[PDB]
Chain A
Amino acid sequence: SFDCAVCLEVLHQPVRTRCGHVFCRSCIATSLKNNKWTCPYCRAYLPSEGVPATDVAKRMKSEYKNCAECDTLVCLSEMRAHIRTCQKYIDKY
């Protein structure tokens, strides 16, 4: 699974915490803004946001998924860019 446990979407700019958990950069940043020093998954103490999960980003370049609203096959590294601009998404929101 390449999903983020915070936003439930495909990971975007993944970041890995000290406790080993991986979130979108903006998701772990916003988590820590709201509940400082705490992992949003396992509640472990976190002295910082973490480091870019470059291994996960590399693996996502070769994975694909169908769009939840237009069924088009999209590369996981580009999924956030797709849902930002997909008319079926824009239409619903």
Chain B
Amino acid sequence: MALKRIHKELNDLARDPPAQSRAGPVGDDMFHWQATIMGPNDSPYQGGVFFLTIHFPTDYPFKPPKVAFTTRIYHPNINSNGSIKLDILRSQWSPALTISKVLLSISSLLSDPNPDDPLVPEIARIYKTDREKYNRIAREWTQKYAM
């Protein structure tokens, strides 16, 4: 069940590769993937390359994959352990979602943070009251950890 669905996703990724992310299994553990996401243009992450680890559950797609950044990133919805606060990875997961769609949602999160439901309150505070300070710090972390 889950294994065939994961294989199908990998094949569709190879047949129409996305313009701004790559993803695939680590060795021949089909349930353990690594992904790369480009920092979005017009965001403070622009020019950066961010690595993610993906663990699929054995009842996928009925439970969400576990997704975390391994590259350090300064963002109000991603913490120092790489955990991602994103509703489609939790209560709003649906079985029609795919890794391709998750990666697009994470790119959208980088472009447009959600400072009102944050994972890191201190960063959300800066994002809301001093946007250019947030931009400067996020850019500095991109230059240090993602390039």
Establish whether residues B94 and A68, one from each chain, have CB atoms under 8 Å apart when the complex forms. no
Q: Is A6 an interface residue (CB 8 A)?
A: yes
Q: Which residue in A5, A27, A34, A68 is a CB contact (below 8 Å) of B11? A: A68
B4 CB to closest chain A CB, in angstroms?
7
Known: A30-B62, A34-B59, A68-B11. A41 touches B3 (CB 8 A): no
**Chain A 24-46 against B: per-residue CB contact (8 Å), 1 yes, 0 no?**
00010011011100101101000
Q: Provide a sorted-by-A list of 29 A–B residue pairs whose CB atoms are within 8 angstroms.
A: A5-B95, A5-B96, A6-B95, A6-B96, A7-B1, A7-B4, A7-B5, A8-B5, A8-B9, A8-B12, A8-B98, A9-B4, A27-B95, A30-B62, A31-B62, A33-B62, A34-B59, A34-B63, A34-B95, A35-B94, A35-B95, A38-B94, A40-B95, A40-B96, A41-B94, A43-B92, A43-B94, A93-B3, A93-B4
A35 to chain B, nearest CB (A): 8
The interface of chain B, by Cβ under 8 A from chain A, is 1, 3-5, 7-9, 11-12, 59, 61-63, 92, 94-96, 98
Interface of B is mostly: loop
Q: Which residues of A contact B8 (CB under 8 A)?
A: 8-9
Contact (Cβ within 8 A) A40 B94? yes
Residue in B3, B12, B95, B98 whose Cβ sees the most chain A Cβ within 10 Å: B95
Indicate the size class of the contact surface on chain A: 10 to 19
| Interface residues as binary, A55-87 with B (CB distance below 8 Å gives 1, 0 otherwise) | 000000000000010000000000000000000
Assembly CA distance A93 to B2 (angstroms): 12
The interface residues of chain A lying within 8 Å CB-to-CB of B92 are: 43
Whether A31 and B3, one on each chain, are in contact in the complex, defined by CB atoms closer than 8 angstroms, is no
B136 CB, min distance to chain A CBs, angstroms: 39
